[PDB]
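During data preparation, a discrete fold description was generated, and the record follows.
___
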Amino acid sequence: KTHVQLSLPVLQVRDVLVRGFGDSVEEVLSEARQHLKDGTCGLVEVEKGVLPQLEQPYVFIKRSDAAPHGHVMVELVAELEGIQYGRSGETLGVLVPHVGEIPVAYRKVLLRK
């Protein structure tokens, strides 16, 4: 399928143990997509002071359209030293590996895959 319904655990930035997906734009997008498929991807909501506590390159989920079955349609955009790779809508959050951190909420998304 071109889209997959996912429910992403929303993590507090100070709980996150693995603060990024890797070392290049291509690697972080690759790893983000693998973790999304494997159910091992969390979401951190972006506010003042969050991104400097995480590792670049960043992988964002961004709203791709204006929401089937409660699931917002999203796509991935990476960022490294202020340059984004991809073009999309509003940020829903930054993706990180999930390694068993307790979430505060779930974010239902339809991921363009």
